[PDB]
Chain A
Amino acid sequence: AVQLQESGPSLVKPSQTLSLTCSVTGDSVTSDIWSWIRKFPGNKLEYMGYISYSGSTYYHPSLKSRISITRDTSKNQYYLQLNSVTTEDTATYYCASWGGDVWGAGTTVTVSSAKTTAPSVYPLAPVCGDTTGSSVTLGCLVKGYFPEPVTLTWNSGSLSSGVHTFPAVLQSDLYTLSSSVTVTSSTWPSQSITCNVAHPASSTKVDKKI
């Protein structure tokens, strides 16, 4: 059964070149027309172009001049080259057959000039250290890191219910993520609650008691 898999630098700096590889397994790269499709935030899909069984190509006019698609018949892979990128080229990139019958898992490529940056982890507790209802929700603000991702847990994973960890948002070139956790009034502050954040790229891991 034919299968596809994208691979390449997940980070590209503005003005530089984006490069991705799609490895064809199960069949030959010469046995079909292959393409590159990208998905920008907000579910906006773009058909970048495709390379035929002959090596012939068709490029999306919006990308014409910046794009190049090639293949390697002995390695059974085809490639995507996209020049002069800008943050607007940030997206999830997929390789697929022309027939749409096979797709790679996709791989995110982010265009940024930011350098690796460890996050700052801030505790979110009620004003005055209050409490009112039968329950209370605490939080954790993970601000200023690059690149994604970070792993966030509560009490080293011992607190797993009533948690909502939101998708990171870009704030002045860096990422910010927040997480909420809800427990009964009889749980906190009787029992301490700690936010654990790990950022592999910067070799960082910090614990923040609430």
Chain B
Amino acid sequence: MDIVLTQSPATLSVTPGDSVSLSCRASQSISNNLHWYQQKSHESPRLLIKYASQSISGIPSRFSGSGSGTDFTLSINSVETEDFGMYFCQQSNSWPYTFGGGTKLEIKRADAAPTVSIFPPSSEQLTSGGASVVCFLNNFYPKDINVKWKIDGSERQNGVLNSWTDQDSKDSTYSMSSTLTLTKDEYERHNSYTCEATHKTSTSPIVKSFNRNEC
């Protein structure tokens, strides 16, 4: 069977200057045939370590690997500013070659609550017979966040589509847009529409709502 590579954790937030250890585990022994790749946003993968611990001439010395068999580790002594992004491991011991799910290296910063805004369907869209309710949750940290929609007090899951931006280069925060799409007939059948956000910054969910029975 195809060798499965499990990387942990899925994501790791750190402060430049700190050291980190990324783990990759194989469902079978592969000796030293495990390779480490770095892939920054909008860039193709770059090979950092080959055969578990051999260094590539041209790769910064802060990068190093260890392990054998089924347990491997990628270490970065003092992570630097340009080191954040995705890290993947790949085995070449058996065909087909396989990659791990990857570990995301993110920048750590102070928690920030999201700035939430809700928007009703525009007049133009309703005319075309559609109805999208939009909710923006901006500049928050950490990235973990739950968004729940409610129509007339009832949680709604169908018709909801989400989009997330990458960690912001400006302030290292995250932003997200959540959109609930209905038909014009569905929309006009209900009154209260609510975007509810649950985030580490508070035990009480942030709530943004509006009623069709006004404006």
Contact = CB atoms under 8 A, between A and B. Distances in A.
A45 B5 CA distance: 12
Interface string B136-175: 1010000000000000000000000111110000000001
A147 interface: no
A47 B177 contact: no
A164 B136 contact: yes
A180 B117 contact: yes
Contacts of A143: 125, 130, 132
B179 interface: yes
Interface residues of B, number: 47
Contacts of A44: 101
B119 A124 contact: yes
A166 B163 contact: yes
A106 B117 CA distance: 36
B44 A166 contact: no
A171 B177 CA distance: 14
Contacts of B164: 166-167
A47 B99 CA distance: 8
Nearest to A139: B119
Interface string A40-61: 0001111100000000001011
Interface stretch (A19-27, A71-79, A110-118, A125-133): A125-133
A180 B164 CA distance: 13
Contacts of B2: 61
Chain B: interface secondary structure? strand
A171 B159 CA distance: 9
Most buried by B among A44, A99, A122, A167: A122
Contact of A178 (B45, B88, B128, B179): B179
A45 B102 CA distance: 9
B168 to A, nearest CB: 8
B60 interface: no
A161 B118 CA distance: 20
Given A47-B97, A58-B95, A178-B179, A94 B45 contact: yes
Q: How large is the interface on A (under 10, 10 to 19, 20 to 34, 35 or more residues)?
A: 35 or more
A103 interface: yes
A60 B95 CA distance: 8
B37 to A, nearest CB: 7
B112 interface: no
A47 B90 contact: yes
Given A103-B45, A123-B122, A166-B177, A128 B215 contact: yes
B214 interface: yes
Interface in A98-157: 99-101, 103-106, 120, 122-129, 137, 139, 141, 143
A43 B102 contact: yes
B88 to A, nearest CB: 6
B95 A164 contact: no
B199 interface: no
Interface string A60-86: 111000000000000000000000000
17 contacts: A45-B102, A60-B96, A61-B96, A100-B35, A100-B50, A120-B124, A122-B125, A124-B122, A137-B117, A137-B138, A139-B134, A141-B134, A143-B125, A164-B138, A166-B176, A176-B161, A180-B175
Interface of A: 37, 43-47, 58, 60-62, 94, 96, 99-101, 103-106, 120, 122-129, 137, 139, 141, 143, 164, 166-169, 171, 176-178, 180, 182
Given A127-B214, A139-B136, 14 more contacts: A47-B90, A61-B96, A96-B44, A100-B50, A122-B124, A122-B125, A127-B210, A128-B215, A139-B117, A141-B122, A141-B132, A141-B134, A168-B163, A171-B181
Interface of B: 2, 35, 37, 44-47, 50, 56, 86, 88, 90, 95-99, 101-102, 115, 117-122, 124-125, 128, 130, 132, 134, 136, 138, 161-165, 175-177, 179, 181, 210, 214-215
